[PDB]
Structures are given as structure tokens and as C-alpha cells.
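sry for the spam today, last one i promise. C-alpha cells for design, 315 residues
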């Protein structure tokens, strides 16, 4: 069987790869070769102590983790939320190592980085991604529906927004403020991820509807910017803040919907990491890791056939 993950991220410590997925307390897997994966741990034994306060319907599944390494520590960001609501918060928990067999291994929760509130905020605090600029600063991008995707400066700790705060919109789709603020609306965009490559920051995002089986329209788009704070332009030069986004990979008949990607530079090669819904296996999402190439114009390209050729093993 293939490894099932949603909203995947990855990192490497020493000789081992680690995969983090949406799931109870955040599911972690490990591999020595990115193909064959054993269950490693759940970040939280049960759930964050503060979870049910932000979202009372909470079922134990954290969403859309991001893994970040900084001054020798492991920072695991994660999302508490409810379906179709922006009663949400992103928290972070920190570990000295990922090897659960080490006496140094244990996740310590740092609490809420940011929280969205219905009627107050036109954004949904889920789906964090961490990126550093050329000037020592670290930023979180996040978001889903509502008024789209945001970027803000983190403080020294990486646990809360820097003060005074510094925010930038980075991608959006149409929405009138006259809509009820508690509704997700029709801006089908989520799940930012920023990769630095050469002189550019590349913003990946997911458009369309995930989690809908045969009706899913989820696919990936991309834009690029010389500065981390934007504006991110697609290939036709259109700002993602006004709905720009160049198609990177979309589904077909075997893979109905794919996305919430991450992306990495390991050993002078680049990889695209995402989930895709298998039409043959009940539209159950599967891990896929694709080779991420770059054309002569500075734009990433992927080979959609790799949705088939990449076959991960759950051991
Ligand atoms: O493989 C590993 C396992 O899979 C996971 O199980 C799958 C699912 O993933 C987890 O959640 C995924 C997150 O959900 C996606 O959707 C984001 C949501 O969409 C946006 O809202 C859209 C809006 O919602 C719908 O209407 C909502 C109605 O209003 C509510 O109040 C009412 O309850 C709803 O009926 C409409 O379609 C649309 O208008 C929001 O921004 C957001 O809520 C995100 O992309 C993912 O991050 C979840 O656990 C499973 O459902 C397992 O977790 C893992 O083990
Ligand atoms: Cl993500």
C-alpha cells in the first residue's frame, strides 16, 4: 500500500527523512530513502491543551503542519480548526531532535502563534509555512479562503508575530466584504509555500476544492517575487494578489485533485511534495514526491507522469 498523507511536509536530520502529515496530533513517518516509510510518532500524544478553546468541535486532527529547523532546534507549526470555519489558530511545538529513540526527543508546546476570529478577521489561521529572507528575518505565510493568503514577521523566538507587527497580503481571489464574514466564500485558494531559488522567492498555492472525491478541482499554481514580501507575479506578469497563478500541475483520470504541496532543496536537487487523490483507491489521498525542474526562464516544471511512477511504501 501507498503512504496516505494530507498536506505533507518533510525535513532531514543526519541520514534520515521525516514526513509530517495532517492527522491526530500530527502524524510523523520516517524513511532512509524517501520511498519506504515506517510510522515514527504523533507530535502530540492526544491534542494541544488549548485546542478545544479555539475550536470546540475539534476531533484530534491537527492540520497542515510545517517543519522548520533553526539554531539546532525542530520547530513544528500546526493548525487547530473546524471545517468551513475560521475559528482557527496556528501553534508551534519544538523538539531537540526527530529520532523518537533519543533521550533528547520530546515535543514541547509553545502555544498560539496566531488565531483568527469570525467577524474580526478576513483570513483563516491555518496552513503555516516558514521562510527566511536574505536579512536574517523569518516570516510565516498562511491561509485558506476568506481574504486569502498572508505573510507576517516572526519574533526572535519564532513563536509569535514580531512587535510592532509587519504583515503583507501575498495571494487572493475575489470576495466582496458585503458577504457574511463567517463564510469561507468562493475564493478557492490555500496552502502557501515559499521556496527560495536563485534571485527569486516562489510562492506555491493550491486552487479549487480539495476533499471532494470525484468533484475535486484541487491543483497547484505558482508565482515569483524578488522580495519575500511580494508582489508574487505569475508567468503572464499578474499579481497573485489579484488572482494570478500559473498552472504547475493538475489532476487527470487517475488523480482527481492534488495539492497542498511543499518543496525542498536537498543535495543540489529540488523536489515537489504533495498529496493526490487516487480514483482507483476510493479517492484516498497518496503521498507523491516529484522532481522539481527549472526552465530557461526561471520557472519550475514537473512531470505529471510522476504521479504514477512515484510509488511510496507503508511498512
Ligand atoms: O491521509 C491522512 C489523513 O487524512 C486526513 O483526513 C482528510 C481531511 O483532512 C483534514 O482536514 C483537511 C483540511 O481541510 C481542508 O479544507 C479546508 C476547509 O475548506 C475551507 O472551507 C471551505 C468551505 O467549506 C464548505 O462549507 C463548510 C460548511 O460550513 C461549516 O460551518 C459546516 O460544518 C460546513 O458544512 C464549503 O465546501 C466551502 O465553502 C476552510 O478554509 C477550511 O475549513 C484544508 O485544505 C485542509 O487543511 C480533516 O481531518 C479531514 O477532513 C486526516 O486528518 C489524516 O489522518
Ligand atoms: Cl502547508
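last one done:
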Amino acid at each position: 500500500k501507498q503512504v496516505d498523507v494530507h498536506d505533507p511536509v518533510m525535513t532531514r536530520e543526519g541520514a534520515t527523512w521525516y514526513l509530517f502529515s495532517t492527522g491526530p496530533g500530527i502524524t510523523i513517518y520516517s524513511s532512509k530513502d524517501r520511498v519506504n516509510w515506517r510510522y515514527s510518532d504523533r507530535a502530540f500524544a492526544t491534542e494541544p491543551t488549548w485546542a478545544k478553546r479555539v475550536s470546540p468541535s475539534f476531533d484530534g486532527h491537527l492540520w497542515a503542519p510545517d517543519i522548520y529547523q533553526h539554531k539546532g532546534l525542530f520547530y513544528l507549526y500546526y493548525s487547530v480548526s473546524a471545517f468551513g470555519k475560521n475559528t482557527s489558530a496556528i501553534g508551534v511545538t519544538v523538539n531537540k531532535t526527530l529520532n523518537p529513540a533519543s533521550p533528547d526527543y520530546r515535543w514541547e508546546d509553545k502555544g498560539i502563534v496566531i488565531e483568527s476570529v469570525p467577524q474580526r478577521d478576513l483570513w483563516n489561521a491555518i496552513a503555516p509555512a516558514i521562510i527566511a529572507d536574505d536579512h536574517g528575518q523569518v516570516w510565516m505565510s498562511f491561509g485558506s479562503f476568506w481574504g486569502g493568503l498572508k505573510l507576517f514577521k516572526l519574533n526572535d523566538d519564532l513563536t509569535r508575530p514580531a512587535e510592532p507587527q509587519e504583515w503583507h497580503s501575498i495571494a487572493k481571489l475575489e470576495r466582496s466584504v458585503l458577504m457574511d464574514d463567517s463564510q469561507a466564500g468562493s475564493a478557492q485558494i490555500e496552502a502557501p509555500f515559499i521556496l527560495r531559488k536563485g534571485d527569486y522567492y516562489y510562492l506555491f498555492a493550491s486552487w479549487g476544492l480539495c476533499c471532494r472525491k470525484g468533484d475535486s478541482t484541487y491543483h497547484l499554481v505558482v508565482g515569483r517575487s524578488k522580495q519575500v514580501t511580494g508582489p508574487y507575479l505569475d508567468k503572464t506578469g499578474r499579481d497573485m494578489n489579484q488572482g494570478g497563478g500559473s498552472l504547475l500541475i493538475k489532476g487527470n483520470k487517475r488523480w482527481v485533485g492534488l495539492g497542498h504541496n511543499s518543496a525542498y532543496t536537498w543535495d543540489g536537487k529540488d523536489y515537489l511534495v504533495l498529496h493526490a487523490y487516487e480514483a482507483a483507491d476510493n479517492y484516498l489521498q497518496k503521498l507523491k514526491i516529484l522532481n522539481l525542474h527549472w526552465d530557461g526562464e526561471g520557472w519550475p516544471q514537473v512531470d505529471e507522469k510522476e504521479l504514477d511512477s512515484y510509488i511510496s511504501q507503508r511498512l
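The CA atoms of residues 85 and 256 lie 25 Å apart. ok im logging off now
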